[PDB]
Write a protein that binds this ligand. Sequence first.
Ligand code: MN
Ligand code: MN
Ligand code: MN
Length: 430
Amino acid sequence: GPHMATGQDRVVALVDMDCFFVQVEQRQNPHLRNKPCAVVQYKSWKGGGIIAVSYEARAFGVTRSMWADDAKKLCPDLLLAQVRESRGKANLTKYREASVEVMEIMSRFAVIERASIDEAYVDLTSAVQERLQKLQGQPISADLLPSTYIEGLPQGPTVQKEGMRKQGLFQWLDSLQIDNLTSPDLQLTVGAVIVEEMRAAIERETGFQCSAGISHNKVLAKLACGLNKPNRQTLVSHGSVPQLFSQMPIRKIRSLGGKLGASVIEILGIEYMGELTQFTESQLQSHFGEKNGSWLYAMCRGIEHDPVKPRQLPKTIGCSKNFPGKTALATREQVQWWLLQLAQELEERLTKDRNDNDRVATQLVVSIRVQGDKRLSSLRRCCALTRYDAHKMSHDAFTVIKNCNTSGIQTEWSPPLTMLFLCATKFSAS
DNA sequence: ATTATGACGCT
DNA sequence: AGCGTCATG
Ligand SMILES: [Mn+2]
Ligand SMILES: [Mn+2]
Ligand SMILES: [Mn+2]
């Protein structure tokens, strides 16, 4: 009762750019705006592999991981933009630079955690307390929440999307106790006001639209963000969790979409997040380990404590290329040439990073995949990264992997390599 | 022949 | 340190 911690001590938002790489390309080329369009890597094999899809194209069933030729079967008028190719490989610099644009705007409102190229968590707890003290106890107008959905509302005793959104928002605001600076629902509402402002700033200053979730923790904020896309934000209150989770497939919660979530389903004989509440913490720890078990016990009640880490920059800077089927690397000259291509891209990105961010990487990780291996990485080896020089990094990577060539001939490489990966890690301030 | 990233947990 | 999992623009 009075000592049951309810995990309502923070306001956390997740901001995620809508179909991000597509928006980057649509900003650059107005002919692609408000069209079914997708972003592809490469072109020769099956028209290229789609990695981002505008919402107009999604309506035709176009998805990521689809070959462009197949997408064109679903959507003959689909427009395509191709990722830049540099040194023989896809180069994602344009999207990384656009990401920095957005992250720098978000950082004006609060410290952020970069979770991906297109998304960041925000801890708004302090900004909410400030805005509440500024509000002097006056209530929150629906006009301050023009794109906000309140999950679970309207309910109880209009057939248009926007009409329903406004009905739910009015029910929410009507029930608010705007005199209590410690009410979690009020705190979330003010958080949503701030996120409206943040999203407006992003769109005004970049042209990019985003969606967002506002809740008491990272998992609920991410889940909330997905509920009303594109270009909308969703507030998931603590009180909304029992109904929300009662029909929520376990795989929808971040970290449960793979083998662990499948094992929760199979071992416990359940389907939905809410069904987890019927197990004790010890039962869940017995099946899934002490850490997972405690996390599941709290998560299915809407409670999670993972902090928004103060980190706007990536921890690693890496370069990767697959060599599938008949293009696998089977000679030493080939392996060396591609290691050099990767290392040259890595050098360029590292040198820019050192100038921008006042840090230097100190470890080089070299990863390969060998033909016949079912795993995505067949071997990982680290060595020292003491100089931002591509020829040195590629020679070092070759040295750490050369013992993998099972061939007796040193000119040939067997079995051929289907993946090279160079990653710079362990940054230090400089 | 999804491909190219990047974070994090385990031992 | 090296491996596996989870994520999916
Ligand atoms: Mn996105
Ligand atoms: Mn995202
Ligand atoms: Mn996505």
